[PDB]
Amino acid sequence: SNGRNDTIPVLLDIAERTGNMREFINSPFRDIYYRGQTALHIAIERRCKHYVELLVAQGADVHAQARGRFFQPKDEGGYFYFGELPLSLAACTNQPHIVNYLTENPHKKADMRRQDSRGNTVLHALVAIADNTRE
Amino acid sequence: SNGRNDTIPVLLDIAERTGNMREFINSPFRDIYYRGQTALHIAIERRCKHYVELLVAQGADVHAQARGRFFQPKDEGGYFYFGELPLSLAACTNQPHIVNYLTENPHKKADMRRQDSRGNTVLHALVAIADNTRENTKFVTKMYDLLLLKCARLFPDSNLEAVLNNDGLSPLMMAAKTGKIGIFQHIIRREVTDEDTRHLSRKFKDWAYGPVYSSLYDLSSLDTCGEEASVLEILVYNSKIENRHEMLAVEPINELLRDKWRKFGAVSFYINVVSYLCAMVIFTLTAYYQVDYLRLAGEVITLFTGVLFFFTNIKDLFMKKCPGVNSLFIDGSFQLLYFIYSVLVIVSAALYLAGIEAYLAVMVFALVLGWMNALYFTRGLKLTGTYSIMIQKILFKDLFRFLLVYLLFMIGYASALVSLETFSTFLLDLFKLTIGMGDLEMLSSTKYPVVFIILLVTYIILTFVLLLNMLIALMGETVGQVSKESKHIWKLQWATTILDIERSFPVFLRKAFRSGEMVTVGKSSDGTPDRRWCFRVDEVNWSHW
Amino acid sequence: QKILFKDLFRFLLVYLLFMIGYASALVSLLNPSETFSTFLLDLFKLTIGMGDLEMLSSTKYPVVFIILLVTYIILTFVLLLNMLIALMGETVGQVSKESKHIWKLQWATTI
Ligand SMILES: Cc1nc(C)c(-c2csc(Nc3ccc(C(=O)N4[C@@H]5CC[C@H]4CN(c4ncc(C(F)(F)F)cn4)C5)cn3)n2)s1
């Protein structure tokens, strides 16, 4: 709410003492509709640059796959197909700052050449999301 | 003058000296035109704030009923209807400061729930004054919001919009029936984001994932399973036809009609059509034989269909009926055809039992009118609905007044031509001649071989060329302008068919096929969830994030 | 092809519907079985005006039969000709640009 939530820093502070920091920021939702969507996907689609920076600073993942039925083309019975990668999600939601940060960061960067399950790269996803409008 | 006269405070001082201040500043004009307009109404309508504050300071009256004939709707013979309250008058003249002050003031305040002699609240008055213009709809919607929110903050109870007038109409159905796109559309997709006053909204934000926004429209009054007054039935039946199309094309209504179609509407119609075609085939087979037991069963089936149509047409009298439905193509035009076909069938049966030999003529007329009736069921597709609308327009035009007076023109010119029982014979001969199957043998018996020659040439000219040209030009004028209202009245016909199918179902069947879904859209007093029958409409927008 | 698809089927459907209904109604006034083909042929001939009305006098009631024939002729001819003319005019005044756009497609296809 209101662009910030102070709980996450304390939650990560607890998690690192629990000794599961690599496993903590990872959540392949067993549900069919939300299969593979980790916390980085949520942080990116919420347009929260600071939280994306924080989560990638802990070194979780930059190549997580959003394989759920929700994350499928409308022809297959989905609602939003952006590719299946956090970089593809950032590119398909019009977040240039997130794309820039994910491409050039010290911790871990997602290569633009990576292909999802369908083989689509970031540009294939950008083509898929585009409709013949102006904005 | 110049916004201030200094005589008012002095006169009020004299009045308070005289000890009649309650009766001094109160002016129930006994004139029939101004029956009730007190000084507060005059102060407010002059766009003056300091004087209205000054007069209301001593507490004269704030709920004065301006029952005058001048303060009545233009349809009743007035010139300005604003409700009948100073608060409603201030709200109907775009005076946000006056309406603000009249509510949050120490001395005396006007409750927004108060109703005039018509039962109209201030929101009803705002709906009544609104028309379909930008500079009007702007402040009407803005101050309708303002008033709804203000009545929501104070009195944490049922919203002001839930108060019905003496006709049972809330502002929503009042706007739907009277035909205002502005306030009606604003109410339909009303979204309030404040936490305290959130239950007032009618369009929610169920879920969102980047550039996809699944909004959740409310169907509190749009779709009611019979046991309430509904906006949709009023829109389709009781509204201003001049402006009915633009209000059936709003966000929930059109997709709600499509959902009803897909659910039961389209499939009821196909069951409804195939049955009528089968009945028409059975009736044709029965007529072709006029085995006798089988054709008697077919005749019984035909009589059953005829009596069903007769009961359907008669039962409408005790229901929504008696408009000027003689020219409307919203199933009003086909309703008279239904009734005529049923009456022909019934009269044929009666003459079949009364011994009159003219039974078969009426029965065959019933069969042919029944096939022209089977032409009705092409409303299921726009490509065929437009064709049906055009062909029915021509049938409702071609055979009527101009063709009728064309027959009368034949009558008159036959009467003029005869003899410068022979009248009827010459009439038949001329009728055959005009089509081309007649003969010119009448020239021999003419007493004047001159005059008639040129006269017959002129008669042929007018009867054939002129009438054919004007008849063709009739559809020539129609088509170019009606290319769009063809589909407009097609939409009206489709919606009317869906709603008429829906009514015939029992209440439990309507609830079984009820559209939308129950959603907990928020919290209320005592933590009770808002269980509103809502209608999801998924959307997409790459402009706001 | 556009006229054959969208318009020819509707015209034929309406024409056959009216013809079958009215022909069955007229046969309902028969006097004795196999007269279906001959009666349909004579009605079709009378539609343009080349037919014979010899069988008309054999019916019991001449007035209603003649009136119904007149209604058949006027309604079918006027309505069907008017709908043909109106639909073709509207099509050629509306989708000429769409046909222009289309022709390019099979031109490129042929290439
Ligand atoms: C201009 C007009 N004036 C009047 C008075 C009109 C009028 C009134 S009733 C009527 N014509 C009727 C009446 C009754 C029925 C009928 O038995 N039904 C309806 C609803 C349930 C049941 C089966 N059906 C159906 N249910 C689900 C599907 C699914 F599988 F797709 F889900 C498919 N089909 C349709 C059909 N048609 N016409 S019309």
Curated annotation (Swiss-Prot), chain A:
Localization per Swiss-Prot or TrEMBL: Cell membrane; Apical cell membrane; Cell junction, Adherens junction; Cell projection, Cilium
Binding residue positions for ATP: 34-37, 46
ANK repeats by residue range: 35-64, 82-111
Effect of mutating residue 97 to P: Strongly decreased interaction with membranes enriched in phosphatidylinositol-2,4-bisphosphate. Loss of interaction with membranes enriched in phosphatidylinositol-2,4-bisphosphate
Effect of residue 71 to L: In FDAB; poorly expressed on the cell surface; mutant channels show a significantly reduced response to agonists
Post-translational modification: N-glycosylated.
Impact upon substituting residue 68 to V: In FDAB; poorly expressed on the cell surface; mutant channels show a significantly reduced response to agonists
Protein residues bound to a 1,2-diacyl-sn-glycero-3-phospho-(1D-myo-inositol-4,5-bisphosphate): 47-49, 94-97
Tissue: Found in the synoviocytes from patients with (RA) and without (CTR) rheumatoid arthritis (at protein level).
Residue(s) carrying Phosphotyrosine: 51
Phenotypic consequence of residue 93 to A: In MTD; impairs protein folding or stability
Summary of subunit composition and partner proteins: Homotetramer. Self-associates in an isoform-specific manner. Isoform 1 and isoform 5 can oligomerize, but isoform 2, isoform 4 and isoform 6 cannot oligomerize. Interacts with calmodulin. Interacts with Map7 and Src family Tyr protein kinases LYN, SRC, FYN, HCK, LCK and YES. Interacts with CTNNB1. The TRPV4 and CTNNB1 complex can interact with CDH1. Interacts with PACSIN1, PACSIN2 and PACSIN3 (via SH3 domain). Part of a complex containing MLC1, AQP4, HEPACAM and ATP1B1. Interacts with ITPR3.
Protein's job: Non-selective calcium permeant cation channel involved in osmotic sensitivity and mechanosensitivity. Activation by exposure to hypotonicity within the physiological range exhibits an outward rectification. Also activated by heat, low pH, citrate and phorbol esters. Increase of intracellular Ca(2+) potentiates currents. Channel activity seems to be regulated by a calmodulin-dependent mechanism with a negative feedback mechanism. Promotes cell-cell junction formation in skin keratinocytes and plays an important role in the formation and/or maintenance of functional intercellular barriers. (Microbial infection) Facilitates hepatitis C virus (HCV) replication, possibly through its action on DDX3X.
Domain notes per entry: The ANK repeat region mediates interaction with Ca(2+)-calmodulin and ATP binding. The ANK repeat region mediates interaction with phosphatidylinositol-4,5-bisphosphate and related phosphatidylinositides.
Disease: Brachyolmia 3: A form of brachyolmia, a clinically and genetically heterogeneous skeletal dysplasia primarily affecting the spine and characterized by a short trunk, short stature, and platyspondyly. BCYM3 is an autosomal dominant form with severe scoliosis with or without kyphosis, and flattened irregular cervical vertebrae.
Protein known as: Transient receptor potential cation channel subfamily V member 4
UniProtKB/Swiss-Prot annotation, chain C:
Intramembrane segments: 36-55
Residues noted as binding Ca(2+) in the record, renumbered to the chain: 52
Recorded consequence of changing residue 50 to D: Loss of Ca(2+) influx. Loss of DDX3X translocation to the nucleus
Transmembrane stretches, start-end: 3-30, 64-92
Subcellular localization: Cell membrane; Apical cell membrane; Cell junction, Adherens junction; Cell projection, Cilium
Tissue: Found in the synoviocytes from patients with (RA) and without (CTR) rheumatoid arthritis (at protein level).
Extracellular topological intervals: 56-63
Post-translational modification: N-glycosylated.
Protein origin, superkingdom: Eukaryota
Notes on the domains: The ANK repeat region mediates interaction with Ca(2+)-calmodulin and ATP binding. The ANK repeat region mediates interaction with phosphatidylinositol-4,5-bisphosphate and related phosphatidylinositides.
Subunit structure: Homotetramer. Self-associates in an isoform-specific manner. Isoform 1 and isoform 5 can oligomerize, but isoform 2, isoform 4 and isoform 6 cannot oligomerize. Interacts with calmodulin. Interacts with Map7 and Src family Tyr protein kinases LYN, SRC, FYN, HCK, LCK and YES. Interacts with CTNNB1. The TRPV4 and CTNNB1 complex can interact with CDH1. Interacts with PACSIN1, PACSIN2 and PACSIN3 (via SH3 domain). Part of a complex containing MLC1, AQP4, HEPACAM and ATP1B1. Interacts with ITPR3.
Similarity comment text for this entry: Belongs to the transient receptor (TC 1.A.4) family. TrpV subfamily. TRPV4 sub-subfamily.
Function: Non-selective calcium permeant cation channel involved in osmotic sensitivity and mechanosensitivity. Activation by exposure to hypotonicity within the physiological range exhibits an outward rectification. Also activated by heat, low pH, citrate and phorbol esters. Increase of intracellular Ca(2+) potentiates currents. Channel activity seems to be regulated by a calmodulin-dependent mechanism with a negative feedback mechanism. Promotes cell-cell junction formation in skin keratinocytes and plays an important role in the formation and/or maintenance of functional intercellular barriers.
Noted disease: Brachyolmia 3: A form of brachyolmia, a clinically and genetically heterogeneous skeletal dysplasia primarily affecting the spine and characterized by a short trunk, short stature, and platyspondyly. BCYM3 is an autosomal dominant form with severe scoliosis with or without kyphosis, and flattened irregular cervical vertebrae. Spondylometaphyseal dysplasia Kozlowski type: A form of spondylometaphyseal dysplasia, a group of short stature disorders distinguished by abnormalities in the vertebrae and the metaphyses of the tubular bones. It is characterized by postnatal dwarfism, significant scoliosis and mild metaphyseal abnormalities in the pelvis. The vertebrae exhibit platyspondyly and overfaced pedicles.
Name by which UniProt lists this protein: Transient receptor potential cation channel subfamily V member 4
